[PDB]
Amino acid sequence: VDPTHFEKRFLKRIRDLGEGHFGKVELCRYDPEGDNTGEQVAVKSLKPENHIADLKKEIEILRNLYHENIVKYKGICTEDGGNGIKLIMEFLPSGSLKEYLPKNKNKINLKQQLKYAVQICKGMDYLGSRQYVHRDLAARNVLVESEHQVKIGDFGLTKAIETDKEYYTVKDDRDSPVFWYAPECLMQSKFYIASDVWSFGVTLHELLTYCDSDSSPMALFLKMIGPTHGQMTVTRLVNTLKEGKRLPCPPNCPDEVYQLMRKCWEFQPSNRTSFQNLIEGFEALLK
Numbered sequence: 037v038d039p040t041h042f043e044k045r046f047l048k049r050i051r052d053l054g055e056g057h058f059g060k061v062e063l064c065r066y067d068p069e070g071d072n073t074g075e076q077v078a079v080k081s082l083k084p085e086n087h088i089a090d091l092k093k094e095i096e097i098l099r100n101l102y103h104e105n106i107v108k109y110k111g112i113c114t115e116d117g118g119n120g121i122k123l124i125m126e127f128l129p130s131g132s133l134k135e136y137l138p139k140n141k142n143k144i145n146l147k148q149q150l151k152y153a154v155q156i157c158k159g160m161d162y163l164g165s166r167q168y169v170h171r172d173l174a175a176r177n178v179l180v181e182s183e184h185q186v187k188i189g190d191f192g193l194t195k196a197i198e199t200d201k202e203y204y205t206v207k208d209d210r211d212s213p214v215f216w217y218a219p220e221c222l223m224q225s226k227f228y229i230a231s232d233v234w235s236f237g238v239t240l241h242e243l244l245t246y247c248d249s250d251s252s253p254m255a256l257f258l259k260m261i262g263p264t265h266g267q268m269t270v271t272r273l274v275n276t277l278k279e280g281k282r283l284p285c286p287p288n289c290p291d292e293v294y295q296l297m298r299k300c301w302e303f304q305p306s307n308r309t310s311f312q313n314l315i316e317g318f319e320a321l322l323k
C-alpha cells in the first residue's frame with residue numbers, strides 16, 4: 037500500500053455529486069481506519085467508456101494550484117492492472133452556483149454577489165499568474181463552500197500558455213462552452229487570459245440573475261440568433277458579437293456593476309479589463 041495516495045477500497049461511496057467532461061464526481065468518506073472518523077471527499081472518476089490522459093492533465097493542473105478560491109487538491113487514487121486514476125478534492129457541500137443560487141435568492145443579496153465576483157476574480161488572477169487559461173468559466177464550475185465562500189471547482193478544459201506567449205491554440209474544441217466564449221476563441225480557437233475575462237463577464241451575468249435557467253447565456257443568445265441553426269450557431273454568435281450586441285443588464289444590477297461586465301466584453305482581447313482591475317473595481321463598490 038502507498039500511504040501517500042488514496043486507497044480505492046477505503047473511498048467509501050456515498051452519493052453522486054455531478055458529471056464533468058472526462059469524469060463524474062461522487063461524494064465518498066475516506067475511512068481507512070474503519071471507525072467512521074475519516075473525512076468526506078469529492079472524487080472524480082472516468083465515466084463508463086473522453087479519456088484517462090485528459091483526467092491526468094487535470095490532476096497535473098490541480099496539483100499545481102493552491103488558492104483560497106480554488107477547489108483544494110487532496111490526492112489521487114491509482115487503479116490496479118490498468119491505466120485508471122481518480123482525482124480527490126475537498127468536498128464543497130453546497131455544490132455549484134448554478135444549483136445554489138436559485139435556492140437562495142432571498143438569502144444572497146447584491147453585496148454577497150459582489151463578494152463572490154471578487155473571490156472568482158482572485159481565483160482567476162491566481163490561475164493566470166500560473167500561466168493557465170481556464171476555458172470553461174461558467175457558474176456551473178464555481179462551487180459554493182458556504183454562503184460566504186466560493187471556489188473555482190473544475191479544470192477539465194484548462195490549458196497552459198507557453199512562457200512569453202499570449203494565447204494557447206485549441207486543436208480540440210469539441211465541447212467548448214461557445215456561449216461563454218470570446219470572439220477570438222470562436223473565430224480562431226485562440227485562448228488568452230483576456231478570453232477568461234470575457235467568460236467571467238458571462239459568469240457575472242449568471243450570478244446577478246441567480247442562475248435563472250430562462251436567463252442563461254445560452255437561452256438569451258439563442259433568443260437573439262434563433263434556435264434552429266445547428267452547425268451555423270457559432271457563425272451566428274460571431275455575427276451578433278461583431279455587430280456589438282451583448283447580453284443586457286440584469287434587472288436590479290446597478291449600472292456601475294454592468295459597466296464592469298461590459299469591460300469584460302470588448303471585442304479585442306487587448307481592450308478588456310484585467311482580473312486584478314476587476315477585483316479593485318468590485319471592492320470599490322463594497323463598503
Ligand SMILES: CC(C)(C)c1nc2c3ccc(F)cc3c3c(=O)[nH]ccc3c2[nH]1
Nearest residue numbers: 053054055056078126127128129131190
Ligand atoms: C460537475 C462538476 C464536475 C463541475 C462538479 N460538480 C461538483 C459538485 C457538485 C455538487 C457538490 F455538492 C459538490 C461538488 C464538488 C465538490 O464538492 N468538490 C469538488 C468538485 C465538485 C464538483 N465538480
